PDB file of C-alpha atoms and ligand atoms in Angstrom:
ATOM      1  CA  UNK A   1      -8.339  12.394  18.438  1.00  0.00           C
ATOM      2  CA  UNK A   2     -10.779  10.053  20.304  1.00  0.00           C
ATOM      3  CA  UNK A   3     -11.588   6.926  18.244  1.00  0.00           C
ATOM      4  CA  UNK A   4     -13.792   7.890  15.261  1.00  0.00           C
ATOM      5  CA  UNK A   5     -17.389   6.901  16.184  1.00  0.00           C
ATOM      6  CA  UNK A   6     -17.955   4.944  12.963  1.00  0.00           C
ATOM      7  CA  UNK A   7     -14.640   3.135  13.560  1.00  0.00           C
ATOM      8  CA  UNK A   8     -15.802   2.328  17.132  1.00  0.00           C
ATOM      9  CA  UNK A   9     -19.027   0.830  15.730  1.00  0.00           C
ATOM     10  CA  UNK A  10     -17.040  -1.108  13.139  1.00  0.00           C
ATOM     11  CA  UNK A  11     -14.762  -2.585  15.810  1.00  0.00           C
ATOM     12  CA  UNK A  12     -17.693  -3.467  18.124  1.00  0.00           C
ATOM     13  CA  UNK A  13     -19.448  -5.473  15.374  1.00  0.00           C
ATOM     14  CA  UNK A  14     -17.178  -8.234  14.057  1.00  0.00           C
ATOM     15  CA  UNK A  15      -8.079 -21.325  10.496  1.00  0.00           C
ATOM     16  CA  UNK A  16      -7.036 -22.735   7.081  1.00  0.00           C
ATOM     17  CA  UNK A  17      -4.803 -20.749   4.691  1.00  0.00           C
ATOM     18  CA  UNK A  18      -7.177 -20.942   1.686  1.00  0.00           C
ATOM     19  CA  UNK A  19     -10.177 -20.013   3.830  1.00  0.00           C
ATOM     20  CA  UNK A  20      -8.357 -17.266   5.743  1.00  0.00           C
ATOM     21  CA  UNK A  21      -7.690 -15.748   2.290  1.00  0.00           C
ATOM     22  CA  UNK A  22     -11.423 -16.265   1.682  1.00  0.00           C
ATOM     23  CA  UNK A  23     -12.743 -14.413   4.750  1.00  0.00           C
ATOM     24  CA  UNK A  24     -10.363 -11.622   3.844  1.00  0.00           C
ATOM     25  CA  UNK A  25     -11.876 -11.416   0.340  1.00  0.00           C
ATOM     26  CA  UNK A  26     -15.403 -11.618   1.782  1.00  0.00           C
ATOM     27  CA  UNK A  27     -14.827  -8.820   4.335  1.00  0.00           C
ATOM     28  CA  UNK A  28     -13.682  -6.691   1.360  1.00  0.00           C
ATOM     29  CA  UNK A  29     -16.570  -7.373  -1.033  1.00  0.00           C
ATOM     30  CA  UNK A  30     -18.970  -6.874   1.904  1.00  0.00           C
ATOM     31  CA  UNK A  31     -17.596  -3.301   2.325  1.00  0.00           C
ATOM     32  CA  UNK A  32     -17.936  -2.670  -1.435  1.00  0.00           C
ATOM     33  CA  UNK A  33     -21.541  -3.928  -1.493  1.00  0.00           C
ATOM     34  CA  UNK A  34     -22.382  -1.452   1.298  1.00  0.00           C
ATOM     35  CA  UNK A  35     -20.637   1.461  -0.410  1.00  0.00           C
ATOM     36  CA  UNK A  36     -20.233   0.754  -4.161  1.00  0.00           C
ATOM     37  CA  UNK A  37     -17.141   2.058  -6.055  1.00  0.00           C
ATOM     38  CA  UNK A  38     -17.576   4.601  -8.919  1.00  0.00           C
ATOM     39  CA  UNK A  39     -17.674   2.957 -12.404  1.00  0.00           C
ATOM     40  CA  UNK A  40     -14.300   2.870 -14.196  1.00  0.00           C
ATOM     41  CA  UNK A  41     -12.945   1.379 -17.467  1.00  0.00           C
ATOM     42  CA  UNK A  42     -10.430  -1.403 -16.826  1.00  0.00           C
ATOM     43  CA  UNK A  43      -8.467  -3.941 -18.846  1.00  0.00           C
ATOM     44  CA  UNK A  44      -6.804  -7.075 -17.451  1.00  0.00           C
ATOM     45  CA  UNK A  45      -3.313  -8.142 -18.583  1.00  0.00           C
ATOM     46  CA  UNK A  46      -0.117  -9.969 -17.513  1.00  0.00           C
ATOM     47  CA  UNK A  47       3.432  -8.831 -16.877  1.00  0.00           C
ATOM     48  CA  UNK A  48       6.452 -11.075 -17.507  1.00  0.00           C
ATOM     49  CA  UNK A  49       8.561 -10.787 -14.367  1.00  0.00           C
ATOM     50  CA  UNK A  50      11.814 -12.528 -13.409  1.00  0.00           C
ATOM     51  CA  UNK A  51       9.727 -14.791 -11.151  1.00  0.00           C
ATOM     52  CA  UNK A  52       6.811 -15.543 -13.432  1.00  0.00           C
ATOM     53  CA  UNK A  53       3.673 -13.957 -14.990  1.00  0.00           C
ATOM     54  CA  UNK A  54       1.978 -11.494 -12.641  1.00  0.00           C
ATOM     55  CA  UNK A  55      -1.636 -10.443 -13.252  1.00  0.00           C
ATOM     56  CA  UNK A  56      -2.232  -6.673 -13.489  1.00  0.00           C
ATOM     57  CA  UNK A  57      -5.270  -4.427 -14.055  1.00  0.00           C
ATOM     58  CA  UNK A  58      -5.100  -1.046 -15.775  1.00  0.00           C
ATOM     59  CA  UNK A  59      -7.665   1.598 -14.716  1.00  0.00           C
ATOM     60  CA  UNK A  60      -8.404   4.349 -17.252  1.00  0.00           C
ATOM     61  CA  UNK A  61      -9.923   7.635 -15.917  1.00  0.00           C
ATOM     62  CA  UNK A  62     -12.957   9.245 -17.519  1.00  0.00           C
ATOM     63  CA  UNK A  63     -10.783  12.349 -17.720  1.00  0.00           C
ATOM     64  CA  UNK A  64      -6.966  12.195 -17.758  1.00  0.00           C
ATOM     65  CA  UNK A  65      -5.588  15.031 -15.611  1.00  0.00           C
ATOM     66  CA  UNK A  66      -2.304  13.520 -14.434  1.00  0.00           C
ATOM     67  CA  UNK A  67       0.684  12.861 -16.629  1.00  0.00           C
ATOM     68  CA  UNK A  68       2.299   9.834 -14.920  1.00  0.00           C
ATOM     69  CA  UNK A  69       1.063   6.234 -14.458  1.00  0.00           C
ATOM     70  CA  UNK A  70       0.447   5.072 -10.895  1.00  0.00           C
ATOM     71  CA  UNK A  71       1.502   1.562  -9.951  1.00  0.00           C
ATOM     72  CA  UNK A  72      -0.455   0.358  -6.937  1.00  0.00           C
ATOM     73  CA  UNK A  73       0.594  -2.617  -4.765  1.00  0.00           C
ATOM     74  CA  UNK A  74      -2.237  -3.979  -2.570  1.00  0.00           C
ATOM     75  CA  UNK A  75      -1.762  -4.812   1.135  1.00  0.00           C
ATOM     76  CA  UNK A  76      -2.813  -7.769   3.269  1.00  0.00           C
ATOM     77  CA  UNK A  77       0.353  -8.814   5.158  1.00  0.00           C
ATOM     78  CA  UNK A  78       1.996 -10.411   2.018  1.00  0.00           C
ATOM     79  CA  UNK A  79      -0.454 -13.307   2.498  1.00  0.00           C
ATOM     80  CA  UNK A  80      -3.884 -11.924   1.536  1.00  0.00           C
ATOM     81  CA  UNK A  81      -5.613  -9.560  -0.853  1.00  0.00           C
ATOM     82  CA  UNK A  82      -5.669  -9.112  -4.607  1.00  0.00           C
ATOM     83  CA  UNK A  83      -6.825  -6.800  -7.408  1.00  0.00           C
ATOM     84  CA  UNK A  84     -10.472  -7.318  -6.289  1.00  0.00           C
ATOM     85  CA  UNK A  85      -9.967  -6.609  -2.565  1.00  0.00           C
ATOM     86  CA  UNK A  86      -8.369  -3.220  -3.477  1.00  0.00           C
ATOM     87  CA  UNK A  87     -10.644  -2.308  -6.395  1.00  0.00           C
ATOM     88  CA  UNK A  88     -12.660   0.118  -4.200  1.00  0.00           C
ATOM     89  CA  UNK A  89      -9.506   2.121  -3.384  1.00  0.00           C
ATOM     90  CA  UNK A  90      -7.945   1.871  -6.861  1.00  0.00           C
ATOM     91  CA  UNK A  91     -11.203   2.822  -8.656  1.00  0.00           C
ATOM     92  CA  UNK A  92     -11.430   6.038  -6.592  1.00  0.00           C
ATOM     93  CA  UNK A  93      -7.709   6.831  -6.967  1.00  0.00           C
ATOM     94  CA  UNK A  94      -8.144   6.458 -10.738  1.00  0.00           C
ATOM     95  CA  UNK A  95     -11.249   8.693 -10.963  1.00  0.00           C
ATOM     96  CA  UNK A  96     -10.389  11.274  -8.256  1.00  0.00           C
ATOM     97  CA  UNK A  97      -6.812  11.875  -9.442  1.00  0.00           C
ATOM     98  CA  UNK A  98      -7.717  11.208 -13.079  1.00  0.00           C
ATOM     99  CA  UNK A  99      -4.624   8.981 -13.450  1.00  0.00           C
ATOM    100  CA  UNK A 100      -4.219   5.617 -15.203  1.00  0.00           C
ATOM    101  CA  UNK A 101      -3.463   3.115 -12.420  1.00  0.00           C
ATOM    102  CA  UNK A 102      -1.670  -0.246 -12.729  1.00  0.00           C
ATOM    103  CA  UNK A 103      -2.960  -2.453  -9.891  1.00  0.00           C
ATOM    104  CA  UNK A 104      -0.617  -5.428  -9.275  1.00  0.00           C
ATOM    105  CA  UNK A 105      -1.383  -9.062  -8.295  1.00  0.00           C
ATOM    106  CA  UNK A 106       2.065 -10.018  -6.956  1.00  0.00           C
ATOM    107  CA  UNK A 107       2.888 -13.527  -5.626  1.00  0.00           C
ATOM    108  CA  UNK A 108       1.615 -14.136  -2.071  1.00  0.00           C
ATOM    109  CA  UNK A 109       3.437 -15.877   0.790  1.00  0.00           C
ATOM    110  CA  UNK A 110       3.939 -18.524   1.971  1.00  0.00           C
ATOM    111  CA  UNK A 111       4.011 -20.035  -1.551  1.00  0.00           C
ATOM    112  CA  UNK A 112       6.366 -17.267  -2.706  1.00  0.00           C
ATOM    113  CA  UNK A 113       8.734 -15.901  -0.051  1.00  0.00           C
ATOM    114  CA  UNK A 114      10.752 -12.743   0.488  1.00  0.00           C
ATOM    115  CA  UNK A 115      12.025 -11.305  -1.709  1.00  0.00           C
ATOM    116  CA  UNK A 116       9.974 -12.572  -4.652  1.00  0.00           C
ATOM    117  CA  UNK A 117       7.269  -9.805  -4.465  1.00  0.00           C
ATOM    118  CA  UNK A 118      10.020  -7.178  -4.168  1.00  0.00           C
ATOM    119  CA  UNK A 119      11.582  -8.339  -7.474  1.00  0.00           C
ATOM    120  CA  UNK A 120       8.184  -8.632  -9.187  1.00  0.00           C
ATOM    121  CA  UNK A 121       7.061  -5.193  -8.060  1.00  0.00           C
ATOM    122  CA  UNK A 122      10.310  -3.803  -9.469  1.00  0.00           C
ATOM    123  CA  UNK A 123       9.664  -5.637 -12.755  1.00  0.00           C
ATOM    124  CA  UNK A 124       6.113  -4.243 -13.100  1.00  0.00           C
ATOM    125  CA  UNK A 125       7.315  -0.677 -12.265  1.00  0.00           C
ATOM    126  CA  UNK A 126       9.948  -1.079 -15.035  1.00  0.00           C
ATOM    127  CA  UNK A 127       7.240  -2.410 -17.359  1.00  0.00           C
ATOM    128  CA  UNK A 128       5.013   0.623 -16.673  1.00  0.00           C
ATOM    129  CA  UNK A 129       7.936   3.055 -17.153  1.00  0.00           C
ATOM    130  CA  UNK A 130       8.472   1.435 -20.598  1.00  0.00           C
ATOM    131  CA  UNK A 131       4.759   1.561 -21.569  1.00  0.00           C
ATOM    132  CA  UNK A 132       4.207   5.163 -20.385  1.00  0.00           C
ATOM    133  CA  UNK A 133       5.195   6.997 -23.659  1.00  0.00           C
ATOM    134  CA  UNK A 134       2.667   4.779 -25.506  1.00  0.00           C
ATOM    135  CA  UNK A 135      -0.150   5.799 -23.128  1.00  0.00           C
ATOM    136  CA  UNK A 136       0.697   9.453 -23.829  1.00  0.00           C
ATOM    137  CA  UNK A 137       2.281   9.860 -20.362  1.00  0.00           C
ATOM    138  CA  UNK A 138       5.650  10.794 -18.873  1.00  0.00           C
ATOM    139  CA  UNK A 139       8.044   7.812 -18.363  1.00  0.00           C
ATOM    140  CA  UNK A 140       8.477   8.445 -14.623  1.00  0.00           C
ATOM    141  CA  UNK A 141       5.927   6.470 -12.577  1.00  0.00           C
ATOM    142  CA  UNK A 142       4.254   6.949  -9.173  1.00  0.00           C
ATOM    143  CA  UNK A 143       4.435   3.897  -6.892  1.00  0.00           C
ATOM    144  CA  UNK A 144       1.761   3.368  -4.272  1.00  0.00           C
ATOM    145  CA  UNK A 145       0.548   0.762  -1.779  1.00  0.00           C
ATOM    146  CA  UNK A 146      -1.223   0.209   1.572  1.00  0.00           C
ATOM    147  CA  UNK A 147       0.300  -1.591   4.605  1.00  0.00           C
ATOM    148  CA  UNK A 148       2.335  -4.503   3.118  1.00  0.00           C
ATOM    149  CA  UNK A 149       1.864  -2.820  -0.268  1.00  0.00           C
ATOM    150  CA  UNK A 150       3.350   0.408   1.157  1.00  0.00           C
ATOM    151  CA  UNK A 151       6.342  -1.645   2.258  1.00  0.00           C
ATOM    152  CA  UNK A 152       6.766  -2.791  -1.384  1.00  0.00           C
ATOM    153  CA  UNK A 153       6.297   0.754  -2.759  1.00  0.00           C
ATOM    154  CA  UNK A 154       8.962   2.011  -0.293  1.00  0.00           C
ATOM    155  CA  UNK A 155      11.434  -0.759  -1.201  1.00  0.00           C
ATOM    156  CA  UNK A 156      10.793  -0.198  -4.886  1.00  0.00           C
ATOM    157  CA  UNK A 157      11.562   3.529  -4.342  1.00  0.00           C
ATOM    158  CA  UNK A 158      14.817   2.787  -2.487  1.00  0.00           C
ATOM    159  CA  UNK A 159      15.926   0.385  -5.240  1.00  0.00           C
ATOM    160  CA  UNK A 160      14.860   2.737  -8.076  1.00  0.00           C
ATOM    161  CA  UNK A 161      18.299   4.319  -8.673  1.00  0.00           C
ATOM    162  CA  UNK A 162      20.253   1.026  -8.721  1.00  0.00           C
ATOM    163  CA  UNK A 163      17.692  -0.455 -11.110  1.00  0.00           C
ATOM    164  CA  UNK A 164      17.640   2.568 -13.450  1.00  0.00           C
ATOM    165  CA  UNK A 165      13.929   3.018 -12.773  1.00  0.00           C
ATOM    166  CA  UNK A 166      12.358   6.531 -12.984  1.00  0.00           C
ATOM    167  CA  UNK A 167       9.996   7.219 -10.064  1.00  0.00           C
ATOM    168  CA  UNK A 168       8.296  10.620  -9.775  1.00  0.00           C
ATOM    169  CA  UNK A 169       6.704   9.955  -6.348  1.00  0.00           C
ATOM    170  CA  UNK A 170       5.848   7.329  -3.714  1.00  0.00           C
ATOM    171  CA  UNK A 171       2.491   7.161  -1.919  1.00  0.00           C
ATOM    172  CA  UNK A 172       2.754   5.137   1.314  1.00  0.00           C
ATOM    173  CA  UNK A 173      -0.535   4.401   3.065  1.00  0.00           C
ATOM    174  CA  UNK A 174       0.002   3.216   6.675  1.00  0.00           C
ATOM    175  CA  UNK A 175       3.070   1.232   5.456  1.00  0.00           C
ATOM    176  CA  UNK A 176       4.948  -1.511   7.300  1.00  0.00           C
ATOM    177  CA  UNK A 177       8.579  -0.327   7.234  1.00  0.00           C
ATOM    178  CA  UNK A 178      10.471  -1.724  10.226  1.00  0.00           C
ATOM    179  CA  UNK A 179      10.187  -5.369  11.226  1.00  0.00           C
ATOM    180  CA  UNK A 180      13.020  -5.087  13.794  1.00  0.00           C
ATOM    181  CA  UNK A 181      12.148  -2.284  16.244  1.00  0.00           C
ATOM    182  CA  UNK A 182       9.258  -2.144  18.716  1.00  0.00           C
ATOM    183  CA  UNK A 183       7.902   1.411  18.489  1.00  0.00           C
ATOM    184  CA  UNK A 184       5.480   2.912  21.116  1.00  0.00           C
ATOM    185  CA  UNK A 185       2.475   2.644  18.740  1.00  0.00           C
ATOM    186  CA  UNK A 186       3.253  -1.056  18.190  1.00  0.00           C
ATOM    187  CA  UNK A 187       3.013  -1.581  21.973  1.00  0.00           C
ATOM    188  CA  UNK A 188       0.127   0.838  22.657  1.00  0.00           C
ATOM    189  CA  UNK A 189      -2.084  -0.623  19.887  1.00  0.00           C
ATOM    190  CA  UNK A 190      -0.915  -4.236  19.875  1.00  0.00           C
ATOM    191  CA  UNK A 191      -4.432  -5.650  20.157  1.00  0.00           C
ATOM    192  CA  UNK A 192      -7.995  -4.620  19.268  1.00  0.00           C
ATOM    193  CA  UNK A 193      -7.379  -2.272  16.311  1.00  0.00           C
ATOM    194  CA  UNK A 194      -7.956  -4.685  13.405  1.00  0.00           C
ATOM    195  CA  UNK A 195      -4.225  -5.292  12.817  1.00  0.00           C
ATOM    196  CA  UNK A 196      -2.869  -7.287  15.756  1.00  0.00           C
ATOM    197  CA  UNK A 197       0.543  -8.207  17.240  1.00  0.00           C
ATOM    198  CA  UNK A 198      -0.199 -11.930  16.731  1.00  0.00           C
ATOM    199  CA  UNK A 199      -1.187 -11.430  13.078  1.00  0.00           C
ATOM    200  CA  UNK A 200       1.973  -9.344  12.334  1.00  0.00           C
ATOM    201  CA  UNK A 201       4.061 -12.229  13.773  1.00  0.00           C
ATOM    202  CA  UNK A 202       2.226 -14.759  11.639  1.00  0.00           C
ATOM    203  CA  UNK A 203       2.583 -12.689   8.429  1.00  0.00           C
ATOM    204  CA  UNK A 204       6.325 -12.443   9.242  1.00  0.00           C
ATOM    205  CA  UNK A 205       6.551 -16.232   9.583  1.00  0.00           C
ATOM    206  CA  UNK A 206       4.849 -16.637   6.180  1.00  0.00           C
ATOM    207  CA  UNK A 207       6.828 -14.006   4.210  1.00  0.00           C
ATOM    208  CA  UNK A 208      10.414 -14.203   5.507  1.00  0.00           C
ATOM    209  CA  UNK A 209      12.768 -17.125   4.868  1.00  0.00           C
ATOM    210  CA  UNK A 210      14.474 -16.957   8.293  1.00  0.00           C
ATOM    211  CA  UNK A 211      14.242 -14.574  11.318  1.00  0.00           C
ATOM    212  CA  UNK A 212      17.461 -12.831  10.208  1.00  0.00           C
ATOM    213  CA  UNK A 213      15.494 -11.492   7.201  1.00  0.00           C
ATOM    214  CA  UNK A 214      13.894  -8.856   9.464  1.00  0.00           C
ATOM    215  CA  UNK A 215      17.022  -6.739   9.278  1.00  0.00           C
ATOM    216  CA  UNK A 216      17.494  -6.917   5.492  1.00  0.00           C
ATOM    217  CA  UNK A 217      16.693  -3.427   3.960  1.00  0.00           C
ATOM    218  CA  UNK A 218      14.289  -4.950   1.403  1.00  0.00           C
ATOM    219  CA  UNK A 219      12.235  -6.292   4.329  1.00  0.00           C
ATOM    220  CA  UNK A 220      12.808  -3.165   6.497  1.00  0.00           C
ATOM    221  CA  UNK A 221      13.286  -0.061   4.247  1.00  0.00           C
ATOM    222  CA  UNK A 222      13.347   2.052   7.456  1.00  0.00           C
ATOM    223  CA  UNK A 223      16.838   0.694   8.330  1.00  0.00           C
ATOM    224  CA  UNK A 224      18.320   2.091   5.112  1.00  0.00           C
ATOM    225  CA  UNK A 225      20.853   4.708   6.445  1.00  0.00           C
ATOM    226  CA  UNK A 226      20.861   7.045   3.409  1.00  0.00           C
ATOM    227  CA  UNK A 227      17.489   8.318   2.170  1.00  0.00           C
ATOM    228  CA  UNK A 228      18.914  11.217   0.118  1.00  0.00           C
ATOM    229  CA  UNK A 229      17.641  11.453  -3.465  1.00  0.00           C
ATOM    230  CA  UNK A 230      14.490   9.281  -2.947  1.00  0.00           C
ATOM    231  CA  UNK A 231      11.170  10.075  -4.736  1.00  0.00           C
ATOM    232  CA  UNK A 232       8.982  12.866  -3.232  1.00  0.00           C
ATOM    233  CA  UNK A 233       6.832  11.087  -0.670  1.00  0.00           C
ATOM    234  CA  UNK A 234       3.294  11.157   0.705  1.00  0.00           C
ATOM    235  CA  UNK A 235       3.116   9.197   3.954  1.00  0.00           C
ATOM    236  CA  UNK A 236      -0.335   8.699   5.488  1.00  0.00           C
ATOM    237  CA  UNK A 237      -0.783   7.140   8.914  1.00  0.00           C
ATOM    238  CA  UNK A 238      -3.724   6.252  11.147  1.00  0.00           C
ATOM    239  CA  UNK A 239      -3.597   7.506  14.767  1.00  0.00           C
ATOM    240  CA  UNK A 240      -4.630   4.123  16.235  1.00  0.00           C
ATOM    241  CA  UNK A 241      -2.406   1.781  14.206  1.00  0.00           C
ATOM    242  CA  UNK A 242       0.638  -0.172  15.549  1.00  0.00           C
ATOM    243  CA  UNK A 243       2.449   0.786  12.307  1.00  0.00           C
ATOM    244  CA  UNK A 244       1.941   4.496  12.995  1.00  0.00           C
ATOM    245  CA  UNK A 245       5.308   5.344  14.582  1.00  0.00           C
ATOM    246  CA  UNK A 246       7.516   3.673  11.953  1.00  0.00           C
ATOM    247  CA  UNK A 247       5.547   5.401   9.161  1.00  0.00           C
ATOM    248  CA  UNK A 248       5.842   8.795  10.850  1.00  0.00           C
ATOM    249  CA  UNK A 249       9.512   8.341  11.781  1.00  0.00           C
ATOM    250  CA  UNK A 250      10.240   7.365   8.153  1.00  0.00           C
ATOM    251  CA  UNK A 251       8.536  10.520   6.852  1.00  0.00           C
ATOM    252  CA  UNK A 252      10.565  12.589   9.360  1.00  0.00           C
ATOM    253  CA  UNK A 253      13.735  10.834   8.138  1.00  0.00           C
ATOM    254  CA  UNK A 254      12.895  11.523   4.450  1.00  0.00           C
ATOM    255  CA  UNK A 255      12.193  15.210   5.286  1.00  0.00           C
ATOM    256  CA  UNK A 256      15.644  15.456   6.912  1.00  0.00           C
ATOM    257  CA  UNK A 257      17.211  13.815   3.809  1.00  0.00           C
ATOM    258  CA  UNK A 258      15.949  16.636   1.575  1.00  0.00           C
ATOM    259  CA  UNK A 259      13.127  14.547   0.124  1.00  0.00           C
ATOM    260  CA  UNK A 260       9.967  16.670  -0.448  1.00  0.00           C
ATOM    261  CA  UNK A 261       7.640  14.927   2.017  1.00  0.00           C
ATOM    262  CA  UNK A 262       4.003  15.365   2.987  1.00  0.00           C
ATOM    263  CA  UNK A 263       3.148  13.702   6.280  1.00  0.00           C
ATOM    264  CA  UNK A 264      -0.513  13.175   7.231  1.00  0.00           C
ATOM    265  CA  UNK A 265      -1.826  11.437  10.354  1.00  0.00           C
ATOM    266  CA  UNK A 266      -5.566  10.711  10.128  1.00  0.00           C
ATOM    267  CA  UNK A 267      -6.797  11.173  13.728  1.00  0.00           C
ATOM    268  CA  UNK A 268      -9.371   8.805  15.228  1.00  0.00           C
ATOM    269  CA  UNK A 269      -8.517   6.347  12.432  1.00  0.00           C
ATOM    270  CA  UNK A 270      -7.243   2.763  12.404  1.00  0.00           C
ATOM    271  CA  UNK A 271      -5.147   0.661  10.035  1.00  0.00           C
ATOM    272  CA  UNK A 272      -6.838  -0.331   6.787  1.00  0.00           C
ATOM    273  CA  UNK A 273      -9.168   2.675   6.589  1.00  0.00           C
ATOM    274  CA  UNK A 274      -8.240   3.510   2.990  1.00  0.00           C
ATOM    275  CA  UNK A 275      -9.901   0.258   1.878  1.00  0.00           C
ATOM    276  CA  UNK A 276     -12.935   0.756   4.127  1.00  0.00           C
ATOM    277  CA  UNK A 277     -15.401   2.997   2.215  1.00  0.00           C
ATOM    278  CA  UNK A 278     -17.797   2.995   5.190  1.00  0.00           C
ATOM    279  CA  UNK A 279     -15.431   5.733   6.566  1.00  0.00           C
ATOM    280  CA  UNK A 280     -15.520   9.196   4.888  1.00  0.00           C
ATOM    281  CA  UNK A 281     -11.794   9.513   5.783  1.00  0.00           C
ATOM    282  CA  UNK A 282     -11.052   7.102   2.880  1.00  0.00           C
ATOM    283  CA  UNK A 283     -12.235   9.690   0.297  1.00  0.00           C
ATOM    284  CA  UNK A 284     -10.499  12.496   2.258  1.00  0.00           C
ATOM    285  CA  UNK A 285      -7.197  10.557   2.021  1.00  0.00           C
ATOM    286  CA  UNK A 286      -7.867  10.076  -1.730  1.00  0.00           C
ATOM    287  CA  UNK A 287      -8.321  13.837  -2.038  1.00  0.00           C
ATOM    288  CA  UNK A 288      -5.015  14.233  -0.102  1.00  0.00           C
ATOM    289  CA  UNK A 289      -3.427  11.979  -2.764  1.00  0.00           C
ATOM    290  CA  UNK A 290      -4.923  14.122  -5.594  1.00  0.00           C
ATOM    291  CA  UNK A 291      -3.760  17.374  -3.951  1.00  0.00           C
ATOM    292  CA  UNK A 292      -0.211  16.017  -3.381  1.00  0.00           C
ATOM    293  CA  UNK A 293       0.194  14.897  -7.004  1.00  0.00           C
ATOM    294  CA  UNK A 294      -0.864  18.321  -8.250  1.00  0.00           C
ATOM    295  CA  UNK A 295       2.393  19.493  -6.607  1.00  0.00           C
ATOM    296  CA  UNK A 296       4.269  16.797  -8.593  1.00  0.00           C
ATOM    297  CA  UNK A 297       2.911  16.923 -12.212  1.00  0.00           C
TER     298      UNK A 297
HETATM  299  C1  TKU B 301     -11.888  -3.712   1.592  1.00  0.00           C
HETATM  300  C2  TKU B 301     -10.503  -4.299   1.773  1.00  0.00           C
HETATM  301  C3  TKU B 301     -10.404  -5.309   2.913  1.00  0.00           C
HETATM  302  C4  TKU B 301      -9.203  -5.218   3.861  1.00  0.00           C
HETATM  303  C5  TKU B 301      -9.215  -4.092   4.887  1.00  0.00           C
HETATM  304  C6  TKU B 301     -10.051  -4.426   6.136  1.00  0.00           C
HETATM  305  C7  TKU B 301     -11.550  -4.550   5.897  1.00  0.00           C
HETATM  306  C8  TKU B 301      -7.797  -3.606   5.225  1.00  0.00           C
HETATM  307  O1  TKU B 301      -6.996  -4.535   6.009  1.00  0.00           O
HETATM  308  C9  TKU B 301      -5.692  -4.291   6.233  1.00  0.00           C
HETATM  309  O2  TKU B 301      -5.115  -3.300   5.854  1.00  0.00           O
HETATM  310  C10 TKU B 301      -5.055  -5.422   6.994  1.00  0.00           C
HETATM  311  C11 TKU B 301      -5.942  -6.019   7.890  1.00  0.00           C
HETATM  312  C12 TKU B 301      -5.568  -7.092   8.668  1.00  0.00           C
HETATM  313  C13 TKU B 301      -4.286  -7.587   8.567  1.00  0.00           C
HETATM  314  C14 TKU B 301      -3.390  -7.022   7.681  1.00  0.00           C
HETATM  315  C15 TKU B 301      -3.730  -5.925   6.890  1.00  0.00           C
HETATM  316  C16 TKU B 301      -2.695  -5.353   5.952  1.00  0.00           C
HETATM  317  O3  TKU B 301      -2.988  -4.879   4.884  1.00  0.00           O
HETATM  318  O4  TKU B 301      -1.425  -5.260   6.420  1.00  0.00           O
HETATM  319  C17 TKU B 301      -0.842  -6.134   7.425  1.00  0.00           C
HETATM  320  C18 TKU B 301       0.574  -5.733   7.877  1.00  0.00           C
HETATM  321  C19 TKU B 301       0.769  -6.246   9.311  1.00  0.00           C
HETATM  322  C20 TKU B 301       1.644  -5.357  10.179  1.00  0.00           C
HETATM  323  C21 TKU B 301       1.807  -6.206   7.095  1.00  0.00           C
HETATM  324  C22 TKU B 301       3.159  -6.268   7.838  1.00  0.00           C
HETATM  325  C23 TKU B 301       3.825  -7.607   8.116  1.00  0.00           C
HETATM  326  C24 TKU B 301       4.873  -7.614   9.209  1.00  0.00           C
END
């Protein structure tokens, strides 16, 4: 419950759009150098979405143990990140679960704005549902994402029924869910825990079209008043993350809507930890993912 010691060390030791994207990529590949991912067979590809081609990467496990494709949406505040920044997480998800994983390079803001990545993420999920029989898998997919990518996975899940899209589960890793309400964790951990109040504002300015967008349910899936019938859900939070309370409240709300829900707070942890392989909690959370999906298919 105190701040993990390795996290403390991490936090102690630490301007242009293109080069802000760059330092994000460099921070990521620096973590991967320090703690290399397992080897995994991949193949690049493209998906035709209603907003353009979107690059994807398919991960193939050494040993296929799971009978649904995972579709992973990377985080980074809708502004940063890509297939490469999240390779360390996706590689381990692929090998630990023994699932084929579709990692998605959706359109980043501010070039694309809300709700372009929502539509594209829906299109890729539909693509994967269509391909699944030909991979030898069940047609129902698992959607998954971290932070901003958890937001997308949550919106995709809520829109699944309307869009005739089969989803077997949703893995939300410290997701952003509510852009309207100021929770206690948002106030208590506003500064100093990697993800900051000022950054969250800036991401919002880049992603949304106008301030009114914050209350739209495809920006804020938490405001959706009827969560009955949604995909079984694994919701992971970090204790010391401003996003913690919305994530946890959402899992509570799903539980009360009859949705089979597993809720896990990682104590001592901060936002982003599932892409930070310097922390052993990253692999623990990946084992949590593998255990949860055993209870699915
Ligand atoms: C090896 C991979 C490198 C990246 C890794 C750190 C080394 C993880 O970083 C993060 O998770 C992260 C860090 C800073 C800013 C944003 C994020 C992020 O994903 O979500 C931002 C949230 C803001 C609330 C979107 C909500 C918009 C209202």
